[PDB]
Design a binder for these strands. Structure first.
Length: 59
DNA sequence: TGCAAAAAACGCATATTCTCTATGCAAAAAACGCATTAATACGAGAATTTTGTAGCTACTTATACAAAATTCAGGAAAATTTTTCTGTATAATGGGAGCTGTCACGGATGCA
């Protein structure tokens, strides 16, 4: 089962230092070059759990 | 239970009279004066005489040389303790002791 890794005893003394020295909050790395739109749900038509990201103007 | 009323007491007629307010007597204190004697103090004399001043004299000390008769600081032996060095001869042939339950981070390497 998906299970709680959320919180609402969250964002406390630890959840700030990770931004103070500016570490890797979420360690993500999404890019940008503008398109941008609903983009199906994951890029191109998505599919069974397919995964991509988003586009409007762009090449 | 209202008084009218009688007798004896209790109130308007003086003797008595007796504490009482009132002056002359008298006796001894006292204090004042006659006063007398003695003592408290003035006068003179020369005697002691201590203090005040000078010079002499004896004691006391200012000072100038220094090795007195005694203290001490090294110097150089011992005296005993202690310290460093050297030496003693069978065989002996690879070292124990915890680290193994922390979370998270930042490089820094290895390993295909």
């Amino acid at each position: 089962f998906e299970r709680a890794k959320t919180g609402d005893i969250i964002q406390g003394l630890p959840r700030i230092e990770e931004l103070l020295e500016a570490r890797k909050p979420k360690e993500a790395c999404i890019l940008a070059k503008r398109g941008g739109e609903v983009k199906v749900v994951y890029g191109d038509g998505d599919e069974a759990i397919a995964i991509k990201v988003i586009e409007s103007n762009g090449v």
